[PDB]
Amino acid sequence: ALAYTLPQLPYAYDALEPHIDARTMEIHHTKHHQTYVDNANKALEGTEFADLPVEQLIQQLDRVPADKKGALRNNAGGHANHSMFWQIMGQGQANQPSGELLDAINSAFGSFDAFKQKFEDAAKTRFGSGWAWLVVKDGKLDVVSTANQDNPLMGEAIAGVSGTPILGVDVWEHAYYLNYQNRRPDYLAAFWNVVNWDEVSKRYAAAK
Numbered sequence: 435a436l437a438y439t440l441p442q443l444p445y446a447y448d449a450l451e452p453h454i455d456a457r458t459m460e461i462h463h464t465k466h467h468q469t470y471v472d473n474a475n476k477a478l479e480g481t482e483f484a485d486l487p488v489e490q491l492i493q494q495l496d497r498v499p500a501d502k503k504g505a506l507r508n509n510a511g512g513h514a515n516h517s518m519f520w521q522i523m524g525q526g527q528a529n530q531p532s533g534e535l536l537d538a539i540n541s542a543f544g545s546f547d548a549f550k551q552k553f554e555d556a557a558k559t560r561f562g563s564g565w566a567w568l569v570v571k572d573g574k575l576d577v578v579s580t581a582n583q584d585n586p587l588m589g590e591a592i593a594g595v596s597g598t599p600i601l602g603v604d605v606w607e608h609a610y611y612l613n614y615q616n617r618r619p620d621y622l623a624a625f626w627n628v629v630n631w632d633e634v635s636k637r638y639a640a641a642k
């Protein structure tokens with residue numbers, strides 16, 4: 435009766451090549467994400483929180499037992515973040531959104547190109563491990579970043595920022611070191627080639 439399972443990827447391990455290497459995809463998924471799933475399930479065992487979806491759980495960290503707060507923040511956080519991450523990438527995806535998402539990007543950031551710059555800048559200036567995010571907050575889009583496995587859905591007091599993510603990029607060095615080593619900006623440039631903007635559009639619609 436374990437709470438979470440490792441999701442299947444929506445594509446093969448080499449589907450994102452050369453932008454993201456196959457070996458990275460496999461380790462990232464089968465070692466790193468799996469560890470977050472396993473440690474989250476351990477932390478949830480003696481609780482009333484094992485039946486909640488992970489995205490609801492991370493919105494309730496203040497309510498869980500005090501001794502399990504850190505472990506769930508880190509591991510439920512890791513699980514939520516990676517689960518989204520696999521889904522917002524895809525193969526055979528210049529790659530950009532359309533329709534209402536693009537309209538929201540133009541009004542929030544000026545243009546898709548200016549949005550990409552702001553997103554990259556957030557991801558670049560994230561010192562240490564973390565994520566950069568495109569969030570819906572008060573019906574409007576913004577770019578924020580978080581430390582480690584914090585997610586904007588955890589709220590401002592915990593994560594330092596708020597909002598409902600519809601896109602994120604993992605800037606933990608494990609996400610890019612085998613292919614780009616220290617060159618995080620090259621990783622980030624490459625990332626735009628794999629974003630599934632149909633998926634991000636669905637998430638935008640879901641988040642308002």
Ligand SMILES: [Mn+2]
Pocket residue numbers: 462466516604606608609
């Ligand atoms: Mn990661």
